[PDB]
Amino acid sequence: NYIERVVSINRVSKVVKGGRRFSFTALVIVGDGKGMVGVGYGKAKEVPAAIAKGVEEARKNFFRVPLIGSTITHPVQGEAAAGVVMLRPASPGTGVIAGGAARAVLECAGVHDILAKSLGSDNAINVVHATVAALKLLQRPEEVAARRGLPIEDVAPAGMLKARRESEALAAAAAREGSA
RNA sequence: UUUGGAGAGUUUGAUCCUGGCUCAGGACGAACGCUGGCGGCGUGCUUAACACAUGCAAGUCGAACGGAAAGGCCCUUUCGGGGG
Ligand SMILES: [Mg+2]
Ligand SMILES: [Mg+2]
Ligand SMILES: [Mg+2]
Ligand SMILES: [Mg+2]
Ligand SMILES: [Mg+2]
Ligand SMILES: [Mg+2]
Ligand SMILES: [Mg+2]
Ligand SMILES: [Mg+2]
Ligand SMILES: [Mg+2]
Ligand SMILES: [Mg+2]
Ligand SMILES: [Mg+2]
Ligand SMILES: [Mg+2]
């Protein structure tokens, strides 16, 4: 079950002595909704070939987002190229809130509650590039604890560890129900 | 130890950056065009601190005093009125 979206379509032109040659391009976003995201950007002379190339590139490119239950861990300010994107965790039930491209990418990722805002470089390509850069910048609390070489409870707050406990309990319950 | 951030269009054969302009919401001590059944609730000179007809918007005490113009009572009557 792979989920796909299309953000924009642009008509590129090529000029020669004879006249004008045209081509099609598009960018696609693919995500499984369980923490998987991929960015694909393909070009072709027709929409079917373009979309096929884009989805193939998305299949080729893969990356795992370390989300905790429903929301992100810590605030992030990712800056890529001329695009800037900010992210912040939310209280449960608030819902997804962001611009077009940010909403598409985050939904394909599969989160439910998060804050976002775009401050420049409105174009979708740079927006998604900045968002994926921020996602790269995000880090896992277990990995940071291992790097620090200190006990987990001494680096993680009570709220976060409790939320992790409840998320693990719910995941175990869902797995048991599915197995049954 | 708790509460909460959305964008879109627009310069170029096609791309990006900065940056301008417009739109999606809420509010009025409001006005205008059209239409217009009823009940309940608030509100009604933001300009000329311009000029004003008119009728009202501050009186009360005889248990303070001198007194009885107009009333009541009792003495009188010619019904003009004479005393307390
Ligand atoms: Mg910068
Ligand atoms: Mg713009
Ligand atoms: Mg709030
Ligand atoms: Mg143009
Ligand atoms: Mg043009
Ligand atoms: Mg500037
Ligand atoms: Mg700008
Ligand atoms: Mg009418
Ligand atoms: Mg009634
Ligand atoms: Mg009224
Ligand atoms: Mg007067
Ligand atoms: Mg007085």
Q: Are A76 and A134 in contact (CB under 8 A)?
A: yes
Distance A147 CA to ligand 5 centre (A): 55
Pairing of strands A76-80, A83-89: antiparallel
- In sequence order, the 6+-apart residues with CB closer than 8 A to the CB of A172 are none
- Experimental technique, in short, is cryo-EM
Q: Which residues pair with A25 in a beta bridge?
A: A10, A43
Q: What are phi and psi of A31, to 5 degrees?
A: -155, 145
Q: Which value in Å is the resolution of this experimental model?
A: 3.3
- A149: CA distance to ligand 11 center in Å? 96
Query: What are the structure tokens assigned to A58, written together?
Result: 């998305």
> In the block, which residue shows the tokens 């989160």?
A111
Q: How far is the CA of A44 from the C1' of B61 (A)?
A: 111
d(CA A180, CA A171): 14
Q: Stated in angstroms, how far is A164 CA from B61 C1'?
A: 89
Å from the A48 CA to the B24 C1': 34
* Reduced 3-state DSSP string for A45-86: CCHHHHHHHHHHHHHHCCEECCCECCECCCCEEEEECCEEEE
Pairwise CA distance, residues A116 & A78, whole Å: 11
Q: What share of chain A is helix, strand, coil (3-state, %, to 5)?
A: 40, 30, 30
